[PDB]
Amino acid sequence: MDNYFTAITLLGLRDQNLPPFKDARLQRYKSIKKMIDLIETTTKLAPPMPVELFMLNPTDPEWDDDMTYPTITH
Amino acid sequence: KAPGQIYAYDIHNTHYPYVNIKQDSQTQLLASFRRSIASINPFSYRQVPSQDRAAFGLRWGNAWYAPNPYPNGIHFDRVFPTHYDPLAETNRTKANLQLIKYAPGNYSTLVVTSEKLPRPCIRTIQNYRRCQMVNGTEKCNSEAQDILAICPNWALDHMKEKVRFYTKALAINNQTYIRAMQVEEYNQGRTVADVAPKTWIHGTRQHLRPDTMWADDRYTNITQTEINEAIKRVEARKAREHEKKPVEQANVNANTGEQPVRVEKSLYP
Amino acid sequence: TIFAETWEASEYQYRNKANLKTLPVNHLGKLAELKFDFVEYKAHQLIACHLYERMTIHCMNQYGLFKDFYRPECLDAQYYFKTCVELNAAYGIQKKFFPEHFVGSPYARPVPQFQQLGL
Amino acid sequence: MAFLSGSATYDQLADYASYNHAMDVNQDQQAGLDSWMSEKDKNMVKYYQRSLGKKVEGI
Amino acid sequence: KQNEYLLEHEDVKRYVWWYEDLKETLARVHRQANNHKACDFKDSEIILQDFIRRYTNPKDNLPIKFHPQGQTF
Amino acid sequence: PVKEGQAKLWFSTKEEADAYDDKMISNIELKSQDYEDENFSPVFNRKTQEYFLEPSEKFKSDFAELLRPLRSLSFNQVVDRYVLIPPNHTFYRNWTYEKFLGGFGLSYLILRELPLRNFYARV
Amino acid sequence: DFAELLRPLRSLSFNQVVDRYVLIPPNHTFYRNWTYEKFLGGFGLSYLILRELPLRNFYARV
Amino acid sequence: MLLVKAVKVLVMGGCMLPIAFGALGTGVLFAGFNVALSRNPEETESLFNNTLMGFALIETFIFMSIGLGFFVLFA
Amino acid sequence: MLLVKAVKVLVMGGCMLPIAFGALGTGVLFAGFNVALSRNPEETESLFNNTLMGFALIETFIFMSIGLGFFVLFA
Ligand SMILES: CCCCCCCCCCCCCCCCCC(=O)OC[C@H](COP(=O)([O-])OCC(O)COP(=O)([O-])OC[C@@H](COC(=O)CCCCCCCCCCCCCCCCC)OC(=O)CCCCCCCCCCCCCCCCC)OC(=O)CCCCCCCCCCCCCCCCC
Ligand SMILES: CCCCCCCCCCCCCCCCCC(=O)OC[C@H](COP(=O)([O-])OCC(O)COP(=O)([O-])OC[C@@H](COC(=O)CCCCCCCCCCCCCCCCC)OC(=O)CCCCCCCCCCCCCCCCC)OC(=O)CCCCCCCCCCCCCCCCC
Ligand SMILES: CCCCCCCCCCCCCCCCCC(=O)OC[C@H](COP(=O)([O-])OCC(O)COP(=O)([O-])OC[C@@H](COC(=O)CCCCCCCCCCCCCCCCC)OC(=O)CCCCCCCCCCCCCCCCC)OC(=O)CCCCCCCCCCCCCCCCC
Ligand SMILES: COC1=C(OC)C(=O)C(C/C=C(\C)CC/C=C(\C)CC/C=C(\C)CC/C=C(\C)CC/C=C(\C)CC/C=C(\C)CC/C=C(/C)CCC=C(C)C)=C(C)C1=O
Ligand SMILES: CCCCCCCC/C=C/CCCCCCCC(=O)OC[C@H](COP(=O)(O)OCCN)OC(=O)CCCCCCC/C=C/CCCCCCCC
Ligand SMILES: CCCCCCCC/C=C/CCCCCCCC(=O)OC[C@H](COP(=O)(O)OCCN)OC(=O)CCCCCCC/C=C/CCCCCCCC
Q: Given an 8 Å threshold on Cβ–Cβ distance, is E52 in contact with A41?
A: yes
Please name which of C54, B210, C44 lies closest in space to residue D28, comparing C-alpha atoms: C44
Residues counted in chain E: 73
State the CB neighbour count (10 A cutoff) for residue G53. Answer: 9
State the CB neighbour count (10 A cutoff) for residue A57. Answer: 11
DSSP for D9-44, please give it: HHHHHHHHHH-HHHHHHHHHHHHT------HHHHTH
Q: How many angstroms separate the CA atoms of B110 and C99, rounded?
A: 16
State the CB neighbour count (10 A cutoff) for residue H61. Answer: 27
Interface membership of D30 toward F (CB under 8 Å): yes
Please name which of I19, I29, I35 lies closest in space to residue I69, comparing C-alpha atoms: I19
- Return all residues near E18 (Cβ < 8 A) that are at least 6 apart: A45, A46, A47, E55
Q: How many angstroms separate the CA atoms of C69 and C82, rounded?
A: 16
Q: How many angstroms separate the CA atoms of B12 and D19, rounded?
A: 51
State the CB neighbour count (10 A cutoff) for residue C103. Answer: 16
Cβ-count burial of B250 within 10 angstroms (0-12 exposed, 13-18 middle, 19+ buried)?
exposed
For residue D2, give the 3-state DSSP assignment: coil
Bridge partners (DSSP) of residue F40 are: F32
In what helix (H) or strand (E) does residue A25 lie, and over which residues does it extend? helix A22-30
Please name which of B43, B8, B221, B212 lies closest in space to residue F101, comparing C-alpha atoms: B43
Q: What angle do CA F62, F63, F68 make, to 5 degrees?
A: 90
Ligand 5 atom with least separation from CA of F91: 27
Q: How many angstroms separate the CA atoms of A46 and D35, rounded?
A: 43
Cβ-count burial of C47 within 10 angstroms (0-12 exposed, 13-18 middle, 19+ buried)?
buried
Q: How far apart are the first and last CA of chain G?
A: 49
Nearest to A49 among E11, E38, E55 (CB): E11
Q: Which residues of B touch D50 (CB under 8 A)?
A: 269
Experimental method: cryo-EM
Q: What is the 3-state secondary structure (H, E, C) of chain F?
A: CCCCCCCECCCCCHHHHHHHHHHHHCCCCCCECCCCCCCECCCCCCCCCCCCCCCCHHHHHHHHHCCHHHHCCCHHHHHHHHHCCCCCCCCCCCHHHHHHHHHHHHHHHHHCCCCCCCHHHHC
**The dihedral of CA A44, A50, A54, A55: what is its sign?**
positive
G48 Cα to the center of ligand 4, angstroms: 12
Q: What is the 3-state secondary structure (H, E, C) of I6-66?
A: HHHHHHHHHCHHHHHHHHHHHHHHHHHHHHHHHHCHHHHHHHHHHHHHHHHHHHHHHHHHH
Q: How many angstroms separate the CA atoms of C72 and B65, rounded?
A: 9
Please name which of E32, I17, A16, E5 lies closest in space to residue H14, comparing C-alpha atoms: I17
Amino acid at B201: I
Q: How many angstroms separate the CA atoms of B12 and B33, rounded?
A: 17
Bridge partners (DSSP) of residue B63 are: B60
- Return all residues near A16 (Cβ < 8 A) that are at least 6 apart: B204, B205, B210, B212, B215, F52
Taking CB atoms and a 6 Å cutoff, what residues make up the pocket around ligand 2? B 34, 37, 41-43, 45, 62; F 99-100, 103-104, 106-107, 110
State the CB neighbour count (10 A cutoff) for residue A72. Answer: 8
In what helix (H) or strand (E) does residue H63 lie, and over which residues does it extend? helix H44-74
Q: How many angstroms separate the CA atoms of E41 and F86, rounded?
A: 52
Whether chain G lies against chain B with 3 or more Cβ pairs closer than 8 A is no
Please name which of B214, B173, F38, G6 lies closest in space to residue E56, comparing C-alpha atoms: B173
Amino acid at I33: F
Q: How many angstroms separate the CA atoms of D1 and D23, rounded?
A: 25
Judge whether A1 and C88 are in contact, CB under 8 Å: yes
Q: Over the range A22-51, which residues count as b (16 or more CB within 10 Å of their CB) and which as e?
A: bbbbbebbebbebbbbbbbbbebbbeebee
Bridge partners (DSSP) of residue B76 are: B101
In what helix (H) or strand (E) does residue B105 lie, and over which residues does it extend? none
Q: How many angstroms separate the CA atoms of C93 and C87, rounded?
A: 10
Give me the helices (H) in chain G, please.
7-10, 14-17, 34-50, 58-61
Dihedral (Cα; B26, B29, B35, B40), 10-degree rounding: -80
Q: How many angstroms separate the CA atoms of I66 and E54, rounded?
A: 75
Q: Which residues of A touch C7 (CB under 8 A)?
A: 1
Amino acid at B1: K
Pocket test for ligand 3, best of G46, G50, G51, G52 (most atoms within 8 A of CB): G46
Residue B133: DSSP 8-state: H
> φ and ψ at B63, to 5 degrees?
-95, -170
State the CB neighbour count (10 A cutoff) for residue B145. Answer: 11
Cβ-count burial of D3 within 10 angstroms (0-12 exposed, 13-18 middle, 19+ buried)?
exposed
Phi-psi map region of D53: left, alpha, beta (phi>0 left; psi -120 to 50 alpha): left
Give me the helices (H) in C63-105, please.
72-97
Cβ-count burial of B203 within 10 angstroms (0-12 exposed, 13-18 middle, 19+ buried)?
buried
Q: Is G23 near ligand 4, meaning CB less than 6 Å away?
A: no
CA dist I73 to H64, H71, H74, I19, Å?
18, 13, 15, 18
Neighbours of H (≥3 Cβ pairs closer than 8 A)? D, I
Bridge partners (DSSP) of residue B5 are: B50
Q: Given an 8 Å threshold on Cβ–Cβ distance, is F60 in contact with G10?
A: yes
Interface membership of B269 toward C (CB under 8 Å): no
Q: After which residues is chain I broken (C to N over 2.5 A)?
A: none
The domain in which residue H47 lies consists of 1-74
Q: How many beta-carbon pairs below 8 A join chains B and E?
A: 72
Bridge partners (DSSP) of residue B20 are: B59
From the candidates A21, A22, A28, which should be mutated to test the interface with D, based on the most D CB atoms within 10 A? A21
Positions of E strands within chain B: 59-60, 63-64, 75-77, 100-102
Give the pairing type, strands B63-64 and B59-60. Answer: antiparallel
Judge whether B181 and B148 are in contact, CB under 8 Å: no
Please name which of C46, C52, C44, C50 lies closest in space to residue C73, comparing C-alpha atoms: C52
Q: How many angstroms separate the CA atoms of B138 and G34, rounded?
A: 98
State the CB neighbour count (10 A cutoff) for residue C20. Answer: 13
Q: Given an 8 Å threshold on Cβ–Cβ distance, is G16 in contact with F65?
A: no
Q: How many angstroms separate the CA atoms of C8 and C11, rounded?
A: 5
Bridge partners (DSSP) of residue A19 are: none
> φ and ψ at F113, to 5 degrees?
-105, 20
Dihedral (Cα; E40, E41, E42, E48), 10-degree rounding: 180
Judge whether G7 and F64 are in contact, CB under 8 Å: yes
- Return all residues near E16 (Cβ < 8 A) that are at least 6 apart: none
Q: Which residue from D minimizes the CA distance to C39?
A: D31
Q: How many angstroms separate the CA atoms of F57 and C64, rounded?
A: 10
DSSP for E1-44, please give it: --SGGGGGSHHHHHHHHHHHHHHHHHHH------SSSGGGGHHH
Q: Given an 8 Å threshold on Cβ–Cβ distance, is C3 in contact with A25?
A: no
Q: How many angstroms separate the CA atoms of C8 and I60, rounded?
A: 50
Pocket test for ligand 1, best of H3, H5, H16, H17 (most atoms within 8 A of CB): H3
Domain CATH number, residue I3: 1.20.20.10
State the CB neighbour count (10 A cutoff) for residue B107. Answer: 11
B49 Cα to the center of ligand 5, angstroms: 21
- Return all residues near C116 (Cβ < 8 A) that are at least 6 apart: none
Please name which of D45, B211, B71 lies closest in space to residue E37, comparing C-alpha atoms: B211
- Return all residues near B219 (Cβ < 8 A) that are at least 6 apart: B213, F2, F3, F21, F24, F25, F28
Ligand 4 atom with least separation from CA of G42: 33
Phi-psi map region of B98: left, alpha, beta (phi>0 left; psi -120 to 50 alpha): alpha
Give the total number of structural domains in chain I. 1
Q: What angle do CA G17, G20, G23 make, to 5 degrees?
A: 100
Distance from CA of C8 to the nearest CA of D (A): 20
Note every long-range contact of B181-190, with CB atoms under 8 Å and residues 24 or more positions apart, other chains counting.
B181/A41, B181/E49, B181/E52, B181/E53, B181/E58, B181/E63, B184/A34, B184/E38, B184/E45, B186/E38, B186/E39, B186/E42, B187/E42, B187/E45, B187/E46, B190/E46
Amino acid at C41: Y
Please name which of B88, F58, F65 lies closest in space to residue C58, comparing C-alpha atoms: F58
C-alpha C61, offset from chain centre: 24
CA dist B258 to B64, B252, B255, C104, Å?
54, 10, 6, 15
CA dist E67 to A38, B114, B167, E7, Å?
21, 19, 11, 22
